[PDB]
Amino acid sequence: VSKGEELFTGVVPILVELDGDVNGHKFSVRGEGEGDATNGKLTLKFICTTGKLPVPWPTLVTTLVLCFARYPDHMKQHDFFKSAMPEGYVQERTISFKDDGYYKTRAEVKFEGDTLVNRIELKGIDFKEDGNILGHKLEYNFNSHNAYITADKQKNGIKSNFKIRHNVEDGSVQLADHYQQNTPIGDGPVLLPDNHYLSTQNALSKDPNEKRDHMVLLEFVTAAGITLGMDE
């Protein structure tokens, strides 16, 4: 069985690198901070290193490290993400924005030295140039949300699909339908969980002394949905 969860008992430095291309609008994001899986807590600051981000920061939150989720002691056996560590997992998504374009993402989440690294390539396709995404019509926030996790035994990993509801500035809602697959990188043993979900909250802010296009993010992720019986 896997030892990977021992890598997360303290505070772990994080590096996020994203290369993106949405309708030919190219961009890069670099994030740094730390993760505290004991509390399910992430604190990161993201910089668009290419200048102006051509999509709204909230649409990249899900793309920009679920190994930092807090799994309750009685659910530690269902934590696929840490079981794959330090070698890591590939995380792939397609995110379909309703009445608009879609993102395709491929990321590798793995330890490089002491640092948990999330390295992402993103392609966006068929967006409306004055839609909610390329038109920057979304509010700078991110609602709390529960994402269901199921095992994908035929790929030795997990999958998830879930709907993100972004608030639009006019008061409407932009749906982002997420389809996700994770598969380990190494050959070691991985935990295939029972069905459960991750409960996530996100607080987005700005650094006053930062002139670049950026996002300060505080995120909590807690696993739930598995019945704790009296057998303990």
Side-chain angles (χ1 to χ4, degrees), residues 1-129 131-152 154-210 212-227 229-232:
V1 281
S2 190
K3 163 270 171 55
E5 77 254 48
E6 308 178 2
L7 301 177
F8 295 89
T9 52
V11 173
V12 172
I14 297 170
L15 168 70
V16 181
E17 308 193 301
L18 178 142
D19 280 338
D21 178 332
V22 173
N23 275 26
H25 308 274
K26 285 179 42 168
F27 60 98
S28 298
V29 177
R30 184 195 189 265
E32 67 188 19
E34 56 185 43
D36 170 14
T38 296
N39 285 312
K41 182 173 153 205
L42 298 180
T43 49
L44 302 144
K45 173 176 177 189
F46 297 95
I47 297 293
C48 176
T49 52
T50 44
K52 168 157 188 48
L53 191 72
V55 301
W57 280 105
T59 71
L60 301 178
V61 165
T62 61
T63 295
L64 300 167
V65 287
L66 293 172
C67 48
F68 287 108
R70 177 171 84 81
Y71 275 80
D73 290 342
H74 83 276
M75 294 180 59
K76 298 300 204 57
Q77 66 278 9
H78 304 274
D79 182 355
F80 164 84
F81 309 102
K82 299 190 185 55
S83 75
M85 296 295 162
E87 295 105 325
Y89 50 83
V90 176
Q91 176 164 300
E92 301 170 304
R93 294 206 183 95
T94 86
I95 307 174
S96 304
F97 298 87
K98 180 178 179 51
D99 296 344
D100 210 326
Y102 64 97
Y103 295 162
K104 288 192 62 156
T105 67
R106 181 187 187 279
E108 302 193 357
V109 186
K110 65 200 197 286
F111 273 93
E112 300 179 9
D114 61 342
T115 298
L116 190 284
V117 185
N118 178 21
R119 186 165 294 110
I120 312 132
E121 50 177 56
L122 175 149
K123 190 80 152 57
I125 280 152
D126 286 326
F127 283 86
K128 302 176 178 174
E129 291 280 342
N132 292 319
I133 305 321
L134 290 177
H136 293 277
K137 304 186 185 181
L138 303 180
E139 313 187 327
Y140 186 69
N141 50 42
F142 192 98
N143 304 333
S144 305
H145 161 78
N146 287 329
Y148 202 74
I149 306 304
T150 65
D152 196 338
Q154 293 176 346
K155 301 203 188 72
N156 201 35
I158 60 91
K159 69 195 171 299
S160 174
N161 70 96
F162 58 91
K163 285 161 176 197
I164 294 300
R165 303 178 141 78
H166 299 290
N167 289 11
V168 183
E169 258 156 10
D170 65 351
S172 53
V173 171
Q174 171 75 59
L175 262 290
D177 189 17
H178 287 61
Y179 278 85
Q180 173 179 340
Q181 312 197 332
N182 295 59
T183 56
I185 287 180
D187 296 310
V190 302
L191 303 173
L192 299 183
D194 298 338
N195 289 3
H196 69 282
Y197 65 95
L198 302 175
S199 184
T200 310
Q201 301 81 30
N202 282 96
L204 282 61
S205 57
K206 299 294 184 174
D207 181 5
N209 305 325
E210 180 60 66
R212 295 162 293 174
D213 201 355
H214 70 294
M215 165 171 72
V216 181
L217 182 63
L218 166 71
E219 178 170 296
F220 295 100
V221 185
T222 312
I226 274 185
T227 81
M230 280 303 304
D231 195 58
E232 304 141 357

